[PDB]
Amino acid sequence: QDLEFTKLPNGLVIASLENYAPLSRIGLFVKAGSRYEDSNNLGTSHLLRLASSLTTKGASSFKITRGIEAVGGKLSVTATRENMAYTVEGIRSDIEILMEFLLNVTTAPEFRRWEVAALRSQLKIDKAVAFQNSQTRIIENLHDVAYKNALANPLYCPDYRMGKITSEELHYFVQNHFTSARMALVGLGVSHSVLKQVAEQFLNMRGGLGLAGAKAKYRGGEIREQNGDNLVHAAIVAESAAIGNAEANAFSVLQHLLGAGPHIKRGNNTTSLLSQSVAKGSHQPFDVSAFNASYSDSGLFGIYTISQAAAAGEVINAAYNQVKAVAQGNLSSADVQAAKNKLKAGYLMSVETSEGFLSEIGSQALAAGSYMPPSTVLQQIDSVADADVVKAAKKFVSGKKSMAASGNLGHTPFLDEL
Amino acid sequence: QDLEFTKLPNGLVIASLENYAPLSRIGLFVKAGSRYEDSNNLGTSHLLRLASSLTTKGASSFKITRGIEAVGGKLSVTATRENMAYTVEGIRSDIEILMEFLLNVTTAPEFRRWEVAALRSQLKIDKAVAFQNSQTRIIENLHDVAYKNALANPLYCPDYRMGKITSEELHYFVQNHFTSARMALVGLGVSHSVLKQVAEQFLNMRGGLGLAGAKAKYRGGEIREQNGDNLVHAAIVAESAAIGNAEANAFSVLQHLLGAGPHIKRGNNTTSLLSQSVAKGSHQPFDVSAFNASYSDSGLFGIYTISQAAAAGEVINAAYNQVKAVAQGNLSSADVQAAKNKLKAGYLMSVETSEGFLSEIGSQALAAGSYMPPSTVLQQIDSVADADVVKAAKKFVSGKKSMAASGNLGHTPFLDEL
Amino acid sequence: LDGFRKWYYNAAGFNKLGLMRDDTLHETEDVKEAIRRLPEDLYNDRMFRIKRALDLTMRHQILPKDQWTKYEEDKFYLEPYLKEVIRERKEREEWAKK
Amino acid sequence: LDGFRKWYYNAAGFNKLGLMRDDTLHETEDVKEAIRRLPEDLYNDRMFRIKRALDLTMRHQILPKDQWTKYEEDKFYLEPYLKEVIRERKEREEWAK
Amino acid sequence: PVLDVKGQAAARPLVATVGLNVPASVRF
Amino acid sequence: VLDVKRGQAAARPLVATVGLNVPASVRF
């Protein structure tokens, strides 16, 4: 059948699709990302993300872990700067107790102090693993140097805050952001009805709108990190459109016109305006993609480069110059059509998997409360037109930009030189 | 008697006082601070400073340590970014072998790989302990977030560079940055004659000028460090005058007008325009002073604040507003006269001690090759006049600022808000 | 029964050393898990009370009668934390049984 | 005499097991210090050679005669370093008395 | 230190992921 | 622990100091 939606009177969104899949997936989406902290409770969302297997009012940690592993199901937590999503999946004959476990974890945690004291070492271990890939550090830093208060908060806990996060901070964060008006329960392979019954036994008691977050403010700037890596990573972004505008579609078409990462294995972005240009700056290993990250109040768009330290300068300059050409109207309609085809194929392959489909429905729910059929999107992306793309470009080319660099930065340029 | 500064043709300048004092001190001044480093040798200087006890091409580390200790002499290696000096102190009878040890250290390090290796663990500590006083971290971060290439290099070795500095690099620095023309040997407690007779032997060897002095470029910016300290430290500086101008004297008079440390224990440093402007609005504990660090090509002048995190904002604003009042001509001649008296008393008490006198002569030597009698200075500081002070102020209030902040920065403002 | 429990509390004699009841529990695995879950101040008072009782037993003395632990006053602090350890312990056991 | 040295060399046969002279020096403290200072490459090489000898000794076999380290081929790597270590101990001793 | 258990450039925002299952990582 | 640990706000540039003597520190 099709997707089916009810908005409960306490604000909770219920979305269901019954496709008779053998494994069914049920997720719950909360507007409780890292942007809702301030300077007093930094890293609380990271410990909340890692604290999904703790003792709840209804099931202990042992009961939750052994009961999910007894049926072979999976419980995972994915977190962005805006949103958290707790997802369980398993056989249709065990999703009743899977919803019991998931809704107990979302609605009634206990946050015992010895459990979080044991979890802080796992918090330290997780941070590093996450920061192995440099692209994590550079991007994290980028958001930080490019925002003042809200989106500048890191996804991972700072080093000083480990050992300082308490049970009361987790309880305050849950009581202020895990309310029914900020939650959507999305189920693929389940009946809508059951979602509702579990949405009344749970998800209905906490029904405020919660604590409203601050508006994110752009700051500009540049933070660098000399650490002696073999490759220089550099991200240069500027403020862009937010979630809910056609200029966001223009910026997505703009990143797919510039290189959005080679499609082919070991690909060279043959027609990627950015990468193609890099040739002039250098003929050595490089990687210049476009970074677009848009959140419900603000967006970041820019270029991302990995290169040898020595050539790091002009390669960055070459990439920047290519965007300036797009800001001068130097583009062809076939290139924009290919960018639109790449963007729509990427969207369809993102929603072709079950967990990506459940995430999409989830995001749409929290964001606009409505489901937008894949088809609808296709025609809206088509709405973006050439001039629109050019426009977004000039925004980047003119908007004060931020910059996060890491590596041997002896030949990496600055913003006033860039 | 008086110093007699004479520039041996090798470029080295010799100068002595022979006060016939009991414990004569002799120090070599060599322009070899981090400034003279570059991006791929970050750290060489730090180790060089801690490696005054490695076997010299003429003496064993063992003898070095034991010898100096036996005679009770002391070798110390101070180092700023603009320069660096090795100093030996001791009885007039044992200063012959003290000059043997010091001149062997300065002109002939064996930098044995095993030895240098043993020190890198000692390096971690220094860079580490020196950071106990948050101020260190700040001033460091400041000189870094403020400059691009030369004066942005840290005094202490970065964390990644520990384990990577090799003997070769060290040797490279000496032979490059530690040459004769860039050095000067001033000695209090010796006969000017012998200095020439013990330098003409070892120092005149490295006749060349040495690696070019990388010029320093201002960048502006702000680097912050959220670490959960009880007090917020914040330094906001701008570009100022260099060594060798009367505007540097104007900036020194400006920091002594704004406040450059308490003169009374447990005083409130009443006069400091800054301290008064903060204390008329904030009853929390605070410490506001004026920061000035001038090097031979560029200078930094600004404000330094320590305050409770909560009040951190307006206190900084209050301090900034006070400087703006000085930029508007709102000052009295008695205040400038008191600032001049404070500056000249600070200079005379800085040169009243023996090691401070030896450092001053040393610095003057490397900087201008000439000795400026304390008296001469007094009349030059007097040359600075009220308008001059105002002028330097406007330079600060206008020039792009550089801000280093650390602590709980939830209420610490940014540069575009400041 | 209440008065006879007070008489037995006086006859047990750990109140004369200033100890609580939960200080006198034998540290098995469950008791050590309950002690590890205590807050820092309660743990520090328990360790000081045990050290003072050991010192008094070393000198073969007791506390003065005004400093003894009144039956009514004794607080069963470890008890709440202990029940949980046992509950969790049993739950786990049952799971294995089944 | 040198010819006699070569004869002794063969007789010593440490060459057979495939080890250089510095390889056999008993690891007296002094020797230990020098070994440590050895540039890593040599140290790792020393280990390989020593270990090989051990394995060969275990099997009661000797390397192919050709593989035997020729007297001429044998070079002294540890010695240069050892000299310093010894001198160092010496210096300390008299400053000691 | 050892990064517990020890090149494609990010072009999209990051999303941490942890849970009962042993795997745990981040994607752009 | 910064080996052996030990408020006045810096107003002057820093100057590391180390050497044969046991003491070693920085001053503004």
TrEMBL record, chain C:
One CC-aspect GO term: mitochondrial inner membrane
Range of residues in the leader sequence: none
InterPro entries registered for this protein in UniProt: QCR7, QCR7_sf
Record carries keyword Membrane: yes
Annotated membrane topology: Peripheral membrane protein
GO molecular function annotation: protein-containing complex binding
Function: Component of the ubiquinol-cytochrome c oxidoreductase, a multisubunit transmembrane complex that is part of the mitochondrial electron transport chain which drives oxidative phosphorylation.
Assigned protein family: Belongs to the UQCRB/QCR7 family.
Subunit structure, interactors included: Component of the ubiquinol-cytochrome c oxidoreductase (cytochrome b-c1 complex, complex III, CIII), a multisubunit enzyme composed of 11 subunits. The complex is composed of 3 respiratory subunits cytochrome b, cytochrome c1 and Rieske protein UQCRFS1, 2 core protein subunits UQCRC1/QCR1 and UQCRC2/QCR2, and 6 low-molecular weight protein subunits UQCRH/QCR6, UQCRB/QCR7, UQCRQ/QCR8, UQCR10/QCR9, UQCR11/QCR10 and subunit 9, the cleavage product of Rieske protein UQCRFS1.
The protein's name in its UniProt record: Cytochrome b-c1 complex subunit 7
Species in which this protein is naturally found: Mus musculus (Mouse)
The encoding gene: Uqcrb
